[PDB]
């Protein structure tokens, strides 16, 4: 599907490149789409609400504060996302149950693994501006990620 | 054989969690058991003594000081430990011959790999109070490890 | 083809050990040969000159200044390296297109992956004393590498 390196060559300055802090935890090597942003901390309630919805062509970008203390995505949440056809997830924080994740048809990029699950309370905000890995992400931007890296573009690419 | 995240979800607070500093190098993705502790540094003497003994039902939890300059476990020592029925090893230190270690039916968690072997002089204690990764380990505690993380408790679980 | 642990046991002090800074990106788990050093920075033009020449029995040792912002080697450059029989590349810097790199019959050790390509200007020097990861490299020196680590020696180790 997507080659981030080839797309950097083609699009040059028209993309930003996230710092190399992520690893792929999902069964899908590359993914792309238009992004919905979320900002939260050690609480995934809001991603539950968002992952219920259809996600075909969308990528969920999550600012979790870079917490590696508690996990934002586990098997339950990722199955939801696969079943609603979400292209992929970018988690500035942690994931859980990694053996189940490497088996699901979704990209998942994250910082680390930790077995403790996040709170479920529903705290946080969506469609807001977030910043991590030296990149600010606006809901509506286009992201592309593979095992090489993650890039962000205002306008779609191809 | 173990899903550390499920475990965190049932036991809640009754479980302690190790900082995400370790990776799996053994052929067993997940293992658990009652722990015997060792404290040593860039010497694997004691370990030979322990792993010569039958380890069925036990996990060797080794505070090697976090050294990544010398490897405490290689193929030979790991094979010994397989043959002696040891469930798994956890090294706050380094291993060696990782290609060989992947093929061996024992759990192995370490911080890093390094081709230089530990000395064999014998120095170190065992059954002593050790601490690393944000966790205190006591001989007779129970540990549970998968590709997601490492948990430790006083009583057995499940 | 090579076991670095083993060679440290046989040769001890006659070998220098590189710090655990690198990962494997190539199809070969292990490799070795006589090194030709390069010193450059976010530019890979010289790498193209060098890898056009026959590399059987040889390892390109690249001091790219540890930059993880620009990738010195990509699929295209590594395929040229395979075509001219090079044993391996050790990059003190980044690589690109990691999925393609895993399938090419050559050894590649590097620090990280970044999607952005290096400049092709050609700046840099060849066959010069370079230092990184606690080791100094001279053309003529011999390198042996695997998933456990990387070592350097003055004379061949067969």
Residue numbers in the entry:
A (entry chain A), B (entry chain B), C (entry chain C): 2 to 159
Quote the original article.
As an inhibitor of RNase E, RraA has widespread effects on transcript levels in E. coli, although its physiological role in ribonuclease regulation is debated. Surprisingly, in vitro RraA does not inhibit the catalytic activity of RNase E directly, but appears to act indirectly by occluding RNA binding regions in the C-terminal domain of the ribonuclease. We have previously shown that RraA can directly interact with RhlB, and it is possible that RraA plays two distinct roles in modulating the degradosome, by inhibiting both its ribonuclease and helicase activities. We present biochemical and structural data to characterize the interaction between RraA and SrmB, and provide structural data on the interaction of RhlB with RraA and compare the two complexes.
Unlike the interaction between RraA and SrmB, the complex formed between RraA and RhlB appears to be mediated entirely by the CTE of RhlB. Despite extensive efforts we were unable to co-crystallize RraA with full-length RhlB, however, it was possible to obtain co-crystals of RraA with a peptide corresponding to the RhlB CTE (RhlB(398–421)). The structure of RhlB(398–421)/RraA was solved at 2.8-Å resolution, and reveals 12 protomers of RraA in the asymmetric unit of the crystal, organized as stacked trimers that generate two hexamers. Due to the poor quality of the density it was not possible to model amino acid side chains for the peptide, but 15 of 23 main chain residues could be traced with confidence (two chains of 6 and 9 residues). The density is located close to electronegative patches on the RraA surface, which is compatible with the complementary electropositive nature of RhlB(398–421) (predicted pI 12.5).
